[PDB]
Amino acid sequence: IALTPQPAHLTVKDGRFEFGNQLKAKVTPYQGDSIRMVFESFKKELQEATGIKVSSTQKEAKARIILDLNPQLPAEAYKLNVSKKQVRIEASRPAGFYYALQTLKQLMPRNVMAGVATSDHSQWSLPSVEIEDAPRFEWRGFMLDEGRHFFGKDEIKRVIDMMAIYKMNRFHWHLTEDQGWRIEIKKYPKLTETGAWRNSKVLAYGDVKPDGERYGGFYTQKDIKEIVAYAKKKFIEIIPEIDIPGHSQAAVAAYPEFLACDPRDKHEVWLQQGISTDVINVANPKAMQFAKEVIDELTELFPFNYIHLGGDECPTRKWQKNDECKKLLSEIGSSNFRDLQIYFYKQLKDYIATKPADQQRQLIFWNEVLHGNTSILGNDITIMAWIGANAAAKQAAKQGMNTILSPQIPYYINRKQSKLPTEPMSQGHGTETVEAVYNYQPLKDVDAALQPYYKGVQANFWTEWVTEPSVLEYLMLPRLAAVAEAGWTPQEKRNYEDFKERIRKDAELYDLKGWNYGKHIM
Numbered sequence: 001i002a003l004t005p006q007p008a009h010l011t012v013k014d015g016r017f018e019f020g021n022q023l024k025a026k027v028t029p030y031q032g033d034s035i036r037m038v039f040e041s042f043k044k045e046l047q048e049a050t051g052i053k054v055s056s057t058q059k060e061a062k063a064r065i066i067l068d069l070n071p072q073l074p075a076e077a078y079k080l081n082v083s084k085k086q087v088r089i090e091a092s093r094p095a096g097f098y099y100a101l102q103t104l105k106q107l108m109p110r111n112v113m114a115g116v117a118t119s120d121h122s123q124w125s126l127p128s129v130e131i132e133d134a135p136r137f138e139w140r141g142f143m144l145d146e147g148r149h150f151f152g153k154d155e156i157k158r159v160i161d162m163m164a165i166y167k168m169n170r171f172h173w174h175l176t177e178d179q180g181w182r183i184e185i186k187k188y189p190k191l192t193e194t195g196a197w198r199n200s201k202v203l204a205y206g207d208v209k210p211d212g213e214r215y216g217g218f219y220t221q222k223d224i225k226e227i228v229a230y231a232k233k234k235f236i237e238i239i240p241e242i243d244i245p246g247h248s249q250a251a252v253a254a255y256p257e258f259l260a261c262d263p264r265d266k267h268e269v270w271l272q273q274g275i276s277t278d279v280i281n282v283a284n285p286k287a288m289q290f291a292k293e294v295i296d297e298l299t300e301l302f303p304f305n306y307i308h309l310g311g312d313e314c315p316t317r318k319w320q321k322n323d324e325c326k327k328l329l330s331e332i333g334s335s336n337f338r339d340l341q342i343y344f345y346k347q348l349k350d351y352i353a354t355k356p357a358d359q360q361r362q363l364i365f366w367n368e369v370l371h372g373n374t375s376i377l378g379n380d381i382t383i384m385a386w387i388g389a390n391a392a393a394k395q396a397a398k399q400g401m402n403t404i405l406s407p408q409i410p411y412y413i414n415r416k417q418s419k420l421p422t423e424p425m426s427q428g429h430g431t432e433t434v435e436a437v438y439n440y441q442p443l444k445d446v447d448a449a450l451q452p453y454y455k456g457v458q459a460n461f462w463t464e465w466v467t468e469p470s471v472l473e474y475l476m477l478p479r480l481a482a483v484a485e486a487g488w489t490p491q492e493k494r495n496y497e498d499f500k501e502r503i504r505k506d507a508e509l510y511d512l513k514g515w516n517y518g519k520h521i522m
């Protein structure tokens, strides 16, 4: 038995459940048939991998598989009880059933989770077990940067597939950057017409120069909707990030006349890595209108109730030199230009609050926003803590803000996972091994009183250096599974050597899916 993430409670019992060629299942009709829909999708996956067919019964006595509603269980929790006679699953919500069925598949040979038939197995069974399971953290995330390099819909579906294996539930889509803007906005076509294309594939840094090759791409709104729907089937919600008002050089290049602090200078999509001073003019009324209208479009495309507005690495230099910005700073009664960033967010937060309930969104920010007078903005925000993350998360929690931990080290899984010279180019020097990732303890030394604010964990994947899907996958796996387990499994049940033995069994899964992965611990 090799389950990842490790469930909260597992007892191995006597004997095995034998599937046979077909069997009857009883599935609760409640919750507007949503649980039957989860089960129908599982039936497809089971048949693909094993050829087993499942029929429906109302009779518990005839049911070899039963899915029952238990309202007492948390939203992502389940019980999975396998005996010789019956598989019994209990959960309170569709996601719980989905995760129970993920665990069920993981109890079978790896091809079942892979969704691929092989010649190896003839008869299918499950070990008898009693499992009660629920995630430690409600937010178990992966972020992909497509601003730096663009991967496109097929690869994002693969990413979602990888996340779902390990019960991750939040995909953070970093779609906008200095070096590219990757989402069609109908009201602002130049964001893609200008911002989605640039004259270099590689991004310059240090002595590395731009390459003069035309490079880019973007998602249509139709593509966005398809991906959102795909992720929903695997109980992954998508949080879009429009990183503003820093990391916005592509947008400024598209609409300099009102977004630039210095509109008489040239503005182009950045062909370099690093930190740009070409930030949005937060004091220009048309810039405010632009941000509102972008948020409006996001609300149409992304149903999840959170939006990420970024706020990392936003130099104030260009604001200090802008008369609109200087006028606004005095008007808001501050002498710190950082407060223009916070005031900008406050205006957007207020705008969102004007909308009907279903269109309202909670806001997430990178932790640098804590350096402003956040009383301007209030504490009903979420802080994604990435730089000095432990300290930043604690500061957020002390202020009553929710926090998500995405520490640069070791949860930036674009970073090298080995010191071997033959590793592909990415950030870091090979210290972010699977072991290092797994050994991070999100709540170490966090006061009991602050722990409720810690909503979970996220691995982030920045693509300055990473251009090819094979390399993305190589760097993602298997470290993604370590973060997934950190998000799911209670700390007291986490053990690196145990994880290593279990994750080794997934090499077969990756091979069957044609996913690349780091081989260092395999």
Ligand SMILES: CC(=O)N[C@@H]1[C@@H](O)[C@H](O)[C@@H](COS(=O)(=O)O)O[C@H]1O
Pocket: 312, 313, 366, 386, 408, 412, 414, 415, 427, 428, 462, 463, 464
């Ligand atoms: C929020 C955030 O991370 N902001 C930036 C990202 O745009 C950048 O891509 C990432 C690279 O990290 S690295 O791979 O560890 O050098 O580091 C930070 O400087």
